[PDB]
Amino acid sequence: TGYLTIGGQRYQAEINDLENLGEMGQVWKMRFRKTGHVIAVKQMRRSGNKEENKRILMDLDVVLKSHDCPYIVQCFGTFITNTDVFIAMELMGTCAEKLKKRMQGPIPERILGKMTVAIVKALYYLKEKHGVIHRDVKPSNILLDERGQIKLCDFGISGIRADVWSLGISLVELATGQFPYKNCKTDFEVLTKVLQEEPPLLPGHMGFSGDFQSFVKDCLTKDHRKRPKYNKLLEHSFIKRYETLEVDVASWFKDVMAKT
């Protein structure tokens, strides 16, 4: 408590040193008046729900243990007052869900490539360094900034259609601009489709690489038995192809945010 550590440089700080630039979507965009630094601040009210206050505390514990993972949002510090805790986090430009809403259609494979590399490495790091299997990988969990960094959101970072499956559905939704269970009226109707219907694979007519379609087919393997672990996805050729390959995520992002 009492410090913001940004870049490798530590500053003494209190909550009043921060200027509220408004809600992001209870994460605030705040400016550290001392420096000009613009950060994200989660506010946890002491009067709040006890279960979800325990989640925030467990999520923070993991975040603080993940300094060495570039693919997870980092914590700069915390402030504790009589009624609140303020958690200072890396600021990111937007999440993939908002990014799809703004775009109003498909996100290009090259972007989803860099995205998949970052998110699978985050999810592998969580499993192999903290014994966490992340429940729900959704587009709202995937953050991007205008330096082209992609990082996993810290929500639920401490937990027959979760994990690898949820990443598969995330990628189809973003690659097509269409949530595959769009026309379902209830969560129950959705679970019905997952169990009874063929997996919602990528269309064959959009110029998606074999690697991308293969990757998604593997995530959407219905049978728990034959369904791959983060360990194996981390070896998939879709990952090998985009892991090394150069993609100007920065310009692409700026282009989008400017044109919308």
Q: Strands 38-45 and 27-32, how do they pair?
A: antiparallel
Q: Strands 18-23 and 27-32, how do they pair?
A: antiparallel
* Residue 137, phi then psi, degrees to nearest 5: -90, 105
10 Å CB burial of residue 160 (0-12, 13-18, 19+) is exposed
Homologous superfamily assigned to 94-259? Transferase(Phosphotransferase) domain 1 (1.10.510.10)
Cβ atoms within 10 A of the Cβ of 133, count? Answer: 13
Is residue 2 within 8 Å of 79, Cβ to Cβ? yes
Query: Which method, experimentally, gave rise to this model?
Result: X-ray
* Residue 198, phi then psi, degrees to nearest 5: -55, 145
| Distance between CA atoms of residues 173 and 217, nearest Å | 14
10 Å CB burial of residue 219 (0-12, 13-18, 19+) is buried
Is residue 96 within 8 Å of 179, Cβ to Cβ? no
- Residue among 136, 145, 211, 218 flagged as catalytic: 136
Annotated catalytic residue 218 = no
| Distance between CA atoms of residues 67 and 74, nearest Å | 6
**24 is known to lie in a ligand binding site:** yes
Tell me the one-letter amino acid at 70: P
**26 is known to lie in a ligand binding site:** yes
**Domain locations in the chain as residue ranges:** 1-90, 94-259
The two three-digit tokens of residue 81, written as one number:
């007052």
Residue count of the chain, please give it: 260
Which of 179, 175, 162 lies closest to 219 in space, CA to CA? Answer: 162
Resolution (A): 2.3
Task: Tell me the CATH number of domain 1-90, given options 3.30.70.1290, 3.40.630.30, 3.30.200.20, 3.10.20.600.
Answer: 3.30.200.20
The two three-digit tokens of residue 214, written as one number:
């293969």
> Residues near 113 by Cβ (< 8 Å), separated by ≥ 6?
212, 238, 241, 242, 245, 247
H or E element in which residue 29 lies: strand 27-32
The two three-digit tokens of residue 252, written as one number:
């692409």
C-alpha dihedral, 45 to 49 to 54 to 58, nearest 10°:
-70
The two three-digit tokens of residue 236, written as one number:
């998939």
Angle, alpha carbons 189-194-199 (nearest 5°): 140
**42 is known to lie in a ligand binding site:** yes
| Distance between CA atoms of residues 118 and 20, nearest Å | 30
Matching residue, tokens 């998604």: 216
